Amino acid sequence: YADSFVIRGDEVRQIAPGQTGKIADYNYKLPDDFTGCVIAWNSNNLDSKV
């Protein structure tokens, strides 16, 4: 299974099995026994507008 989305830069730490924040609990909560992987990168050049 592949789950994709876009978040803010400061909130990347919230995505961590065994953590509770605002995105972590109200938007997307991953079970702590996570048998997988997580990838993230910057997209300011693609998802920004004057």
Partner: protein
């Protein structure tokens, strides 16, 4: 969200993707390239059928 090009770090969007796997709940069908060889016989060998 508010996303301006001039915004400092942490206020700029990041793209995130997570991959979730299973642990032997069905006949596995998703894995990398294995270069299959020929089939020897009548010898003590280990196999990966």
């Amino acid at each position: 969200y508010g996303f301006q090009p001039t915004n400092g770090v942490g206020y700029q969007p990041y793209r995130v993707v997570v991959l979730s796997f299973e642990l032997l709940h069905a006949p596995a069908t998703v894995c990398g390239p294995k270069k299959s060889t020929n089939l020897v016989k009548n010898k003590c060998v280990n196999f990966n059928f």
